[PDB]
Ligand binder design. Structure first.
Ligand SMILES: [Ca+2]
Length: 526
């Protein structure tokens, strides 16, 4: 029989957060899947949420699929540019659209971030059943601030805007907490399914994305765990990554860069609030894991899990952003939060708190990689991923084989026996995948789905990367980089520390040719 699919996406989860990826956070359900499956150390997304999601569900690049930049970042200049529509566009066909016409039941519960309008919903784009947060974020409990002209832009852009199928919801249920509600709905849809046909189940959490919020009883489990701070944590993560074989023992970690005060420079009250944010974060991840368990355990008891291809991934690097640092997110975010929320120590994590853990906590989870979410360095794009499917040969191991989010759609089509329709679908021109099916690799026929000549690009927020084999060039503009192409050998320098631009000018030049072709193939506009 054709397999089921369960595609689970964490939101801004960091590389070493989960237990089997070197973390101290309780993730038993994921860990059971991970150790019996295949853990990926060289799996890549885009550097931010909607770009990644557009790639996941198409098998092509975000600049083609409609999210050339984030909608919330769109300009009048970028306006009519193809692929910069700000929603999944009609130049692509989505994975669920293809499966659904081939007899799969398409079921989703979670964050969408691929369009706000009726014709852009999961219902519109291939899901027979869906319960979805349409924006990029929202209050986990559905506590909404006043909305008027004076509301910070980052809050105006993140209302708790939910749909079920075609119905825009006017209320949320009592006791609504995002991760629990997604677990509840997806379980509902699975229990309500036609058991005589396969399913494609999509479970995009909004945890552990800001605002950091979680049940108090889970936050309590972490009381005091993070009192030694983000650098002490980074060292624990690095040690554990090397003990587990996820990173080689000789790997040189990128230095931590931030403009904030280091832990030892903070006052006791400042530390206590920052540590509490990280305790809350941990609980978000544990609670997400618990919901995943509810879904997976149900499938297991049904006798369906072993014929379910289970993919878990984060959508981008850990979130190091200081939301107060960007005037576009304002005006006066901190003041608004001071007047509308309660970020007192004892209230952090509750519905009427609103915190984010910042650059030092984030870089603890991306280490040894350079930087974090919204950068084209490895910190922003290399994400934890696991595949559990016992029909595959490559299970029980850790793989450092190059892989991307664009490989997923072709892999699942392949397993489903469903052909990509080529260049036309429903009477319109569509893009063909840029990724490659993982089947030969995971079936043990080949060592990897890519090779030394594979070329992949990235570009978002003025930053660039271009990679061929294990050679990668990066471009970070001022004030966050040198506004010049830097060149790295990822096989020797996973931390992107040693710029080889001057010593290997021919390799850089080759990569710059690839970058131009990437721009041209995908329609990148800066
Ligand atoms: Ca994200």
């Amino acid at each position: 029989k054709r397999p089921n699919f369960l595609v689970i996406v964490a939101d801004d989860l960091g590389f070493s957060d989960i237990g089997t990826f070197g973390g101290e956070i309780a993730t038993p359900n994921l860990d059971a899947l991970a150790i019996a499956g295949l853990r990926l150390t060289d799996f890549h997304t885009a550097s931010a949420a909607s770009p990644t999601r557009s790639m996941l569900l198409t098998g092509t690049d975000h600049h083609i699929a409609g999210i050339g930049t984030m909608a919330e970042a769109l300009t009048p200049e970028l306006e009519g540019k193809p692929g910069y529509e700000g929603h999944l566009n009609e130049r692509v066909v989505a994975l669920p659209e293809l499966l659904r016409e081939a007899g799969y039941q398409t079921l989703m519960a979670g964050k969408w971030h691929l369009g706000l309008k009726p014709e852009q919903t999961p219902h519109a784009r291939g899901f027979e059943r869906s319960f979805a947060l349409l924006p990029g974020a929202a209050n986990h409990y559905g506590f909404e601030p006043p909305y008027d002209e004076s509301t910070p832009r980052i809050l105006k852009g993140t209302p708790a805007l939910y749909v079920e199928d075609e119905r825009y919801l006017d209320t949320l249920p009592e006791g609504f907490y995002s991760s629990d509600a997604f677990g509840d709905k997806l379980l509902q849809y699975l229990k309500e399914r036609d058991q005589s046909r396969p399913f494609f189940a999509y479970l995009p959490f909004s945890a552990p994305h800001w605002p950091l919020q979680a049940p108090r009883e889970i936050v309590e489990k972490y009381r005091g765990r993070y009192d030694a701070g983000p650098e002490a944590l980074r060292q624990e993560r690095l040690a554990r990554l090397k003990e587990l074989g996820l990173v080689e023992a000789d790997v040189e970690a990128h230095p931590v860069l931030a403009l904030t005060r280091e832990w030892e420079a903070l006052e006791d009250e400042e530390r206590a609030k920052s540590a509490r944010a990280m305790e809350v974060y941990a609980a978000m991840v544990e609670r997400m894991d618990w919901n995943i368990g509810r879904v997976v355990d149900y499938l297991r008891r049904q006798g369906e899990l072993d014929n379910t291809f289970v993919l878990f991934m984060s959508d981008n690097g850990a979130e190091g952003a200081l939301l107060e640092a960007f005037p576009k997110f304002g005006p006066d975010l901190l003041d608004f939060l001071d007047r509308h929320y309660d970020n007192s120590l004892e209230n952090i994590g509750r519905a009427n708190s609103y915190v984010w853990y910042g650059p030092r906590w984030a870089q603890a989870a991306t280490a040894p990689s350079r930087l974090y979410k919204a950068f084209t360095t490895q910190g922003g794009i290399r994400v934890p991923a696991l595949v559990r499917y016992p029909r595959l040969s490559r299970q029980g191991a850790i793989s450092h084989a190059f892989a991307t989010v664009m490989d997923v759609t072709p892999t699942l089509l392949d397993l489903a026996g469903v052909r990509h329709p080529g260049k036309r679908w429903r009477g319109r021109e569509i893009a063909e995948p840029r990724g490659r099916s993982w089947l030969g690799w995971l079936s043990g026929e080949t060592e990897a789905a890519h090779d030394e000549n594979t070329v992949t690009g990235w570009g978002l927020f003025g930053m660039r990367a271009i990679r061929q084999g294990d050679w990668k060039a990066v471009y970070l503009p001022a004030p966050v980089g040198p506004a010049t192409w830097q060149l790295y050998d990822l096989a020797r320098d996973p931390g992107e520390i040693h710029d080889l631009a001057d010593s290997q000018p021919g390799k850089l030049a080759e990569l710059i040719e690839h970058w131009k072709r990437y721009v041209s193939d995908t329609g990148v506009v800066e």
